[model samples]
Target: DRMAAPRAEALFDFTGNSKLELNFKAGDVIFLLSRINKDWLEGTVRGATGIFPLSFVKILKDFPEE
Candidate 1:
């Protein structure tokens, strides 16, 4: 079986006005997929996949390669 990916928790509410990213609120859980840049990350939340600010979420369990 494949191993599960790492995850994170939203630390604050963020509603991206752009259709290019997913929206999430505080306490929401996000599955860490990969880093987009130094300040952004690509992840999934509330059934949506997109990029979010890395500073907005707290890492729960880090992936070994992270």
Candidate 2:
């Protein structure tokens, strides 16, 4: 059997004000799922998942090669 590659990770660096919010705060660790598009990212935090501005986070780890 083989294991799957690890996905990228990012640390939430700032707060966001949105009509569709994720309830995340600064210093939150968000697990990056997929790139919704340029300038935006999709991730999960404290069981709450939503898309946030890419500028709000800093990449702490890179995804593994597939």
Candidate 3:
């Protein structure tokens, strides 16, 4: 899957010791991730993950049916 670069402040970070730069958007279906027996978390985009604050994009809820 591929997405455009963040136009807004849609950046995510790793909550642990590292600032994992996983860019995330609200309402985006990513994946759940856990590691090192210390953190159980979710991965966003840009190869980063964990609990980070995110601003959202205004994507349409419904799509045009073809």
Candidate 4:
């Protein structure tokens, strides 16, 4: 959000967005957890896949090409 926040704050100046995707580390786990339903969860780490909540994630940004 920080990168996007700055762009929004800077009136769409995309300097901060330049290297965001390149910065994602391998094995980085992205999760989405539900606030109300505590048991609900979703996970996507690298190429691994599983069921998870969309409420607690960093926003899924990509998919592996088949």
Candidate 5:
């Protein structure tokens, strides 16, 4: 869908070896699209869209109308 996702900033580096994970450097702007659960989230950075640790980022805001 063509919609805006919630924004988050990377607090630490998460360079996961698996492709199912989202790898990002520090101070990156991560656009979180969804949460697999409370402990993990799925988002996109530039082009690569994948899952990452929820603790890895600080939420700038949350999705609206949930």
Candidate 6:
């Protein structure tokens, strides 16, 4: 299982241009895989697996932490 996985919800619509970028809509939920940088994140949304910018979403964490 993808334990302690992180997530994010889109704050607004994002129109991805490249092949590795994600195209998402507002209020969409994304299951985050990893952070590409402070300004970017890798995740899946709208049936596509790609990266998105950090400025377009808010963090959604539900797992227990130490």
Q: What's each prediction's TM-score?
A: 0.79, 0.61, 0.27, 0.24, 0.82, 0.80
Best by TM-score: 5
Candidate 1 on 1-66: residue-level lDDT in tens? 136667889999877756567688898879877887778887778877778898999988676583
Candidate 5, which segments miss by more than 4 Å at Cα?
1-5
Per-residue lDDT tens digits for candidate 2, residues 1-66, read 124422233444444466344546677767766666767777777677777777777766544435
Identify the runs in model 3 with alpha carbons over 4 angstroms from their true place.
1-19, 35-40, 44-66
Clash tally for model 3: 1
lDDT of each: 0.79, 0.60, 0.36, 0.29, 0.81, 0.81
User: Where does model 2 exceed 4 Å of error?
Assistant: 1-21
lDDT of 5 by residue, 25-65 (tens): 78887878788888888888867778998898988877665
In model 2, residue pairs whose N, Cα or C atoms come closer than 3 Å (at least 3 residues apart or on different chains), thus clashing, are none
Per-residue lDDT of model 4, residues 1-66, tens digit only: 433221001111111123211112332444322122443343433443344333333344422223
In Å, residue 62's CA in model 2 sits off its true spot by: 3.3
Name the candidate, 4 or 6, with the larger lDDT value: 6
In model 2, the worst 10-residue window by lDDT is: 1-10
lDDT of 5 at 20: 86
The TM-score of candidate 2 is 0.61
Q: lDDT of candidate 4?
A: 0.29
